[PDB]
Amino acid sequence: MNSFENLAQDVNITRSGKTLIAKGTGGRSSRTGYTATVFGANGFLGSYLTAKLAKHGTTVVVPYREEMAKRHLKVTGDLGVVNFLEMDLRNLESIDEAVRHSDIVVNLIGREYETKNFNYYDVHVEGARRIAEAVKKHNIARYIHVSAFNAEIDSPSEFNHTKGLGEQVTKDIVPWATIVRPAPMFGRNPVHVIDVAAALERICFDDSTVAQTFELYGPQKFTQKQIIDMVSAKTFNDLDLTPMELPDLMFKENKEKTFVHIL
Amino acid sequence: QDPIPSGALGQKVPHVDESHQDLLFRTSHMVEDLETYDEDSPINTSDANT
Ligand SMILES: NC(=O)C1=CN([C@@H]2O[C@H](COP(=O)(O)OP(=O)(O)OC[C@H]3O[C@@H](n4cnc5c(N)ncnc54)[C@H](OP(=O)(O)O)[C@@H]3O)[C@@H](O)[C@H]2O)C=CC1
Fold first, then answer.
1. Nearest CA to ligand 1 atom 22
2. What is the DSSP string of chain A?
3. Quick one: A179 exposed, middle or buried, by C-beta within 10 A (0-12, 13-18, 19+)?
4. Angstroms from A221 CA to nearest CA on chain B
5. Residue A107 Cα: closest atom of ligand 1
6. Record-annotated residues binding NADPH (chain A) (predicted)?
7. Is A45:A185 a contact under the CB 8 Å cutoff?
8. What b/e readout covers A142-166, taking b as 16+ CB neighbours within 10 angstroms?
């Protein structure tokens, strides 16, 4: 029968002091006991993330911006596992509401272009300042902020600059938050996306990853010409994972005389 | 039953027996004449269009 390959144990304590006991065997119908809030779970990494997270029965709180991008997240969990409630980055009260009962909480709110509504400064450092100030307000354990590779505090790019700014602000206000920096991602060097989500779930739950910056980069380093010709800190080894190779993933007369043709 | 068949000149011509229609002898390049391996033998058709 399905087992908690998620967990290390059956009775676990969190940092804030709440006691969490896993019920039954691992599987869809069971409950691990953790409550997780995944900001940006409509997106491309968060989909695999709360696929793995709501697989065993952690009550996943999904904050959504649009009502139609969230619908395929209903089938990844049991009755009462995945929970949808709308929020906006602008309205304080919805961020306040979304992290009231969470044990762990992650953001992957990251946008590669400016909108008429949000520049680079608005979604990366300032939204993260906002939601992580709420995390400090409620004393939620295990906050995780996923960032970008090449996140320098001062850089010609504004994206990378503001990713570094978001890292510095969330490290400033919360000391116990963990900030993870993945490589380029190829779901279907670069890292496969199920490997990034596997690494993130193994970040989520254990002790001794606290206040630790992580580099999640794949096995072998590439150039863009090499990639197109193929088409035509702590690493993985902290959390006991081996990332998949990009090349293996990349694919993912007489008889006619004795047949009959005019019938 | 003759040892050397003649060919209207002083030449040797093949005495065409049953043994000339084989898969070895198929697709040997040659003129339309002086050649064996007809495409329609009762041994070559092998009950075609069955
Ligand atoms: N090659 C890559 O993919 C890389 C990505 N990263 C980072 O990892 C994280 C996830 O990766 P990726 O899948 O590519 O990113 P996503 O495609 O998932 O980014 C979109 C998600 O973030 C939400 N988002 C962006 N801005 C806002 C905003 N103002 N308000 C609410 N939601 C917002 C989106 O909301 P909505 O659903 O409405 O669109 C959506 O949920 C990101 O933070 C990214 O910066 C790290 C390095 C490289």
1. A109
2. ----SS-S-SEEE-SSS-EEE-BSSSSSSSB---EEEEETTTSHHHHHHHHHHHHHT-EEEEEESSSSTTGGGSTTS-TTTEEEEE--SS-HHHHHHHTSS-SEEEE----SS--SS--HHHHHTHHHHHHHHHHHHHT-S-EEEE--TT--SS-SSHHHHHHHHHHHHHHHH-SS-EEEEE--B-----B-HHHHHHHHHHHHH-SS-TT--EEE--SS---HHHHHHHH--B-GGGTT--PPPHHHHTT---TGGGS-S--
3. buried
4. 53
5. 43
6. 42, 44-45, 65, 108-109, 111, 163, 185
7. yes
8. bbbbbbbbebeeeeeeebbbbbbbb
A163 is known to lie in a ligand binding site: yes
| Domain spans of chain A, in order of start | 1-263
Q: How many residues does chain A have?
A: 263
- State the resolution, in angstroms: 3.3
Question: Which residue minimizes the CA distance to atom 5 of ligand 1?
Answer: A148
